[PDB]
Design an enzyme around this catalytic site. Structure first.
Site, mmCIF file in Angstrom:
data_model
loop_
_atom_site.group_PDB
_atom_site.id
_atom_site.type_symbol
_atom_site.label_atom_id
_atom_site.label_comp_id
_atom_site.label_asym_id
_atom_site.label_seq_id
_atom_site.Cartn_x
_atom_site.Cartn_y
_atom_site.Cartn_z
ATOM 1 N N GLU A 171 0.778 -1.249 0.000
ATOM 2 C CA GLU A 171 0.000 0.000 0.000
ATOM 3 C C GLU A 171 0.806 1.294 0.000
ATOM 4 O OE1 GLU A 171 -3.142 0.105 -0.677
ATOM 5 O OE2 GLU A 171 -4.066 -1.716 0.210
ATOM 6 N N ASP A 186 -7.545 5.633 -4.874
ATOM 7 C CA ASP A 186 -6.955 4.361 -5.153
ATOM 8 C C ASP A 186 -7.251 4.027 -6.586
ATOM 9 O OD1 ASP A 186 -9.645 3.862 -5.131
ATOM 10 O OD2 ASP A 186 -9.574 2.221 -3.664
#
Length: 164
Positions: free
Chosen positions: A11, A20
Protein backbone atom coordinates in the site's frame (compact mmCIF):
# COMPACT_ATOMS: atom_id res chain seq x y z
CA UNK A 1 8.26 -10.27 7.73
CA UNK A 2 4.71 -10.12 9.04
CA UNK A 3 1.48 -8.80 7.84
CA UNK A 4 2.23 -5.18 8.74
CA UNK A 5 5.36 -5.08 6.73
CA UNK A 6 3.68 -6.97 3.98
CA UNK A 7 1.07 -4.33 3.59
CA UNK A 8 3.27 -1.40 4.00
CA UNK A 9 5.05 -2.77 1.02
CA UNK A 10 1.88 -3.26 -0.95
CA UNK A 11 0.00 0.00 0.00
CA UNK A 12 2.86 2.39 0.46
CA UNK A 13 2.26 5.52 2.40
CA UNK A 14 0.46 8.75 1.78
CA UNK A 15 -0.15 11.59 4.14
CA UNK A 16 -2.68 13.19 1.94
CA UNK A 17 -5.92 12.24 0.49
CA UNK A 18 -5.79 10.40 -2.75
CA UNK A 19 -7.61 8.01 -5.03
CA UNK A 20 -6.96 4.36 -5.15
CA UNK A 21 -6.92 2.44 -8.32
CA UNK A 22 -10.57 2.00 -7.56
CA UNK A 23 -10.96 5.78 -7.81
CA UNK A 24 -11.86 6.12 -4.13
CA UNK A 25 -10.34 8.56 -1.69
CA UNK A 26 -7.80 6.97 0.45
CA UNK A 27 -5.05 8.04 2.64
CA UNK A 28 -2.20 6.84 4.74
CA UNK A 29 -1.53 3.20 4.13
CA UNK A 30 -4.52 2.32 1.99
CA UNK A 31 -6.99 3.76 4.39
CA UNK A 32 -10.22 3.99 2.58
CA UNK A 33 -11.92 7.17 3.31
CA UNK A 34 -15.15 7.07 1.42
CA UNK A 35 -16.80 5.47 -1.52
CA UNK A 36 -18.42 8.81 -2.19
CA UNK A 37 -17.18 10.88 -5.12
CA UNK A 38 -16.81 14.00 -3.01
CA UNK A 39 -13.63 15.41 -1.69
CA UNK A 40 -15.53 17.03 1.18
CA UNK A 41 -17.18 13.79 2.32
CA UNK A 42 -13.73 12.27 2.45
CA UNK A 43 -12.27 15.33 4.19
CA UNK A 44 -15.20 15.11 6.52
CA UNK A 45 -14.68 11.45 7.02
CA UNK A 46 -10.98 11.99 7.65
CA UNK A 47 -11.29 14.64 10.32
CA UNK A 48 -14.06 12.77 11.98
CA UNK A 49 -11.87 9.73 12.18
CA UNK A 50 -8.69 11.57 12.91
CA UNK A 51 -10.50 13.69 15.49
CA UNK A 52 -8.95 17.03 14.52
CA UNK A 53 -9.15 19.45 11.64
CA UNK A 54 -6.92 17.65 9.11
CA UNK A 55 -7.50 19.79 6.13
CA UNK A 56 -6.66 16.76 3.99
CA UNK A 57 -3.23 15.91 5.33
CA UNK A 58 -2.26 13.55 8.11
CA UNK A 59 0.69 12.86 10.24
CA UNK A 60 2.76 9.85 9.93
CA UNK A 61 1.67 8.71 13.36
CA UNK A 62 -1.98 9.04 12.43
CA UNK A 63 -1.45 6.90 9.37
CA UNK A 64 0.03 4.34 11.64
CA UNK A 65 -2.89 4.54 13.93
CA UNK A 66 -5.33 3.83 11.19
CA UNK A 67 -3.23 1.16 9.69
CA UNK A 68 -3.19 -0.65 12.94
CA UNK A 69 -6.93 -0.58 13.24
CA UNK A 70 -7.56 -1.43 9.71
CA UNK A 71 -5.37 -4.44 10.04
CA UNK A 72 -7.13 -5.34 13.20
CA UNK A 73 -10.44 -4.85 11.51
CA UNK A 74 -9.61 -7.25 8.75
CA UNK A 75 -8.45 -10.04 10.93
CA UNK A 76 -11.64 -9.51 12.83
CA UNK A 77 -13.76 -9.45 9.67
CA UNK A 78 -12.42 -12.80 8.52
CA UNK A 79 -12.82 -14.53 11.85
CA UNK A 80 -16.51 -13.41 11.74
CA UNK A 81 -17.29 -14.47 8.20
CA UNK A 82 -18.65 -17.97 7.75
CA UNK A 83 -17.01 -18.37 4.36
CA UNK A 84 -13.54 -17.03 5.24
CA UNK A 85 -12.99 -18.23 8.68
CA UNK A 86 -12.72 -21.91 7.85
CA UNK A 87 -10.37 -21.11 5.08
CA UNK A 88 -8.31 -18.78 7.13
CA UNK A 89 -8.23 -21.37 9.84
CA UNK A 90 -6.93 -23.99 7.44
CA UNK A 91 -4.01 -21.92 6.15
CA UNK A 92 -0.51 -21.88 7.41
CA UNK A 93 0.65 -18.62 8.86
CA UNK A 94 2.19 -17.27 5.70
CA UNK A 95 -0.88 -17.91 3.61
CA UNK A 96 -3.07 -16.36 6.25
CA UNK A 97 -1.44 -13.08 5.57
CA UNK A 98 -2.22 -13.29 1.92
CA UNK A 99 -5.79 -13.91 2.69
CA UNK A 100 -5.76 -10.91 4.86
CA UNK A 101 -3.82 -8.91 2.44
CA UNK A 102 -6.70 -9.60 0.10
CA UNK A 103 -9.42 -8.74 2.54
CA UNK A 104 -7.70 -5.55 3.49
CA UNK A 105 -7.77 -4.65 -0.18
CA UNK A 106 -11.16 -5.67 -1.58
CA UNK A 107 -13.03 -6.26 1.55
CA UNK A 108 -14.67 -9.21 3.15
CA UNK A 109 -17.34 -9.11 0.56
CA UNK A 110 -15.12 -8.91 -2.45
CA UNK A 111 -13.01 -11.71 -1.14
CA UNK A 112 -15.91 -13.97 -0.27
CA UNK A 113 -16.68 -13.77 -3.92
CA UNK A 114 -13.72 -15.95 -4.83
CA UNK A 115 -15.61 -19.08 -4.12
CA UNK A 116 -13.66 -21.71 -5.93
CA UNK A 117 -10.39 -20.12 -5.12
CA UNK A 118 -11.38 -20.22 -1.49
CA UNK A 119 -12.16 -23.89 -1.78
CA UNK A 120 -9.06 -24.66 -3.70
CA UNK A 121 -6.94 -23.01 -1.07
CA UNK A 122 -8.71 -24.56 1.66
CA UNK A 123 -7.97 -27.79 -0.09
CA UNK A 124 -4.28 -27.08 -0.65
CA UNK A 125 -4.63 -26.75 -4.45
CA UNK A 126 -2.08 -24.02 -4.63
CA UNK A 127 -1.46 -23.78 -8.30
CA UNK A 128 -5.06 -23.90 -9.24
CA UNK A 129 -5.73 -21.11 -7.00
CA UNK A 130 -2.67 -19.26 -8.19
CA UNK A 131 -4.21 -19.57 -11.59
CA UNK A 132 -7.80 -18.67 -10.75
CA UNK A 133 -6.81 -15.55 -8.94
CA UNK A 134 -4.86 -14.29 -11.79
CA UNK A 135 -8.09 -14.19 -13.71
CA UNK A 136 -9.62 -11.49 -11.61
CA UNK A 137 -9.89 -7.87 -12.49
CA UNK A 138 -7.66 -7.06 -9.56
CA UNK A 139 -4.94 -8.83 -11.27
CA UNK A 140 -5.15 -6.56 -14.24
CA UNK A 141 -5.46 -3.56 -11.98
CA UNK A 142 -2.65 -4.31 -9.48
CA UNK A 143 -0.64 -6.87 -11.40
CA UNK A 144 2.40 -6.11 -9.34
CA UNK A 145 0.75 -6.77 -6.05
CA UNK A 146 -1.58 -9.59 -7.28
CA UNK A 147 1.54 -11.25 -8.37
CA UNK A 148 3.29 -10.94 -5.05
CA UNK A 149 0.15 -12.12 -3.40
CA UNK A 150 -0.37 -15.04 -5.66
CA UNK A 151 3.22 -16.10 -5.26
CA UNK A 152 2.75 -16.11 -1.56
CA UNK A 153 -0.31 -18.36 -1.72
CA UNK A 154 1.46 -20.50 -4.18
CA UNK A 155 4.80 -20.87 -2.38
CA UNK A 156 3.82 -20.36 1.21
CA UNK A 157 6.81 -18.08 1.69
CA UNK A 158 7.71 -14.41 1.80
CA UNK A 159 10.13 -14.61 -1.10
CA UNK A 160 7.88 -12.25 -3.02
CA UNK A 161 8.64 -9.64 -0.39
CA UNK A 162 12.34 -10.38 0.32
CA UNK A 163 14.11 -8.13 -2.43
CA UNK A 164 15.96 -10.80 -4.45
Amino acid sequence: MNIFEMLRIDEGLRLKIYKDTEGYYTIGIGHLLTKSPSLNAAKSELDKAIGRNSNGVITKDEAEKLFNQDVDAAVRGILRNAKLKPVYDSLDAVRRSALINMVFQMGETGVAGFTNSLRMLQQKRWDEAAVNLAKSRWYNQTPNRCKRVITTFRTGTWDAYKNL
